[PDB]
Symmetry: D2
Subunit: 119 residues, 4 copies
């Protein structure tokens, strides 16, 4: 259910491959923030989920550095894939910026993203 292209509510495009033993690999393209073009993503998912109607736990990380720019920051998404006719990946995310020690307390933004298979 997981492998393929996913779209967030704000325009961002997540292209992922789910490996048979739990690897997530792919690319992320953000429509907002200090970002441009595509960024490598890597993560993990539960490759043997329950069959009781539960979602499939997963997570991945993007470091906001590519050949175009470097935002000195990284976002992790943690959530679950929910299959069926209206399939979705429901996430919460943490975006941590590299900071000085004086600004560490404000290094990390939190949010949520629901991804769907259609725009």
């Amino acid at each position: 259910g997981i492998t393929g292209t996913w779209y967030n509510q704000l325009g961002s495009t997540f292209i992922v491959t789910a490996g048979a033993d739990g690897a997530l690999t792919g690319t992320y393209e953000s429509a907002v923030g200090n970002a441009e073009s595509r960024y490598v993503l890597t993560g993990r998912y539960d490759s043997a989920p329950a069959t009781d109607g539960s979602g499939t736990a997963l997570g991945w990380t993007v470091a906001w550095k590519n050949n175009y720019r470097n935002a000195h920051s990284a976002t992790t998404w943690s959530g679950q894939y929910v299959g069926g006719a209206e399939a979705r990946i429901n996430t919460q995310w943490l975006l941590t910026s590299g900071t000085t020690e004086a600004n560490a307390w404000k290094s990390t933004l939190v949010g949520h993203d629901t991804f769907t298979k259609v725009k």
Copy 2:
């Protein structure tokens, strides 16, 4: 250079990571228990060209809590920064999401924080 090696959490957990020249993090996370049955694959990303100014290096990684022995139907992501020097640290916040039914989705995700050091607590 600074990131690659072994890191210890405040409560006994250990992880060993290699930081690739182009931003990959790969390694193993070992829950406090200490045995093989408590070792899990870790994968993530870091800023491989960080600011050269005394600021942290941004990073994140994921562990799905499934290995050859156990499966919690859960995954944790840590988001943070590495701070180098005599008392080097990785300061993180994490989210642990469990697979749930739709009715219980509201209570799927735990949040916390952890500081990792190069020496045991």
Copy 3:
């Protein structure tokens, strides 16, 4: 300010709040079931002089999950912003902390999000 009145969560919950002239939020939160054992005191604060540039109005509140009928030994805080207009919303993220032993403190806190609207979902 547009905050005073009734708000509805995505999953059935209702709260009724008064926003005081000097930044107080006071009211009652009613869990989705809306029976008589589902009402709890809420208290919080908001920006009583927000920006006039089109920005939202920052606010937060807490409910401790104890009333005359039951005690869940837990508390939720919501942090967010009020957005006024034809489709007014309060956009929030929340943290629900349960009383735990030290051993289980790592799993004490759930995180989530909710959007409150002036009409039912």
Copy 4:
């Protein structure tokens, strides 16, 4: 009785709180250098009849960052538990939401953690 008094954050901030018989938290938060332009109203709730099994006492509170002297158009909520004994502490996680435009809403909310103690660190 355990909660009422002065608490110190790791970073230098101070707050003074009274815990009411029926679950109210009321007080003042001081972000250094505390004189007045640094003092803010805090209000929240706590579990006034916590479990007797060794669990912490759940609580939460909000500060909107406006006073008679300044206004940051933001609000922080802390969610945590009070743990009593010789080394009493309030262990929290917090959310700080700023008023934003709709375009900037995605970056409206900071997350962190604060452990408060009865002696300054």
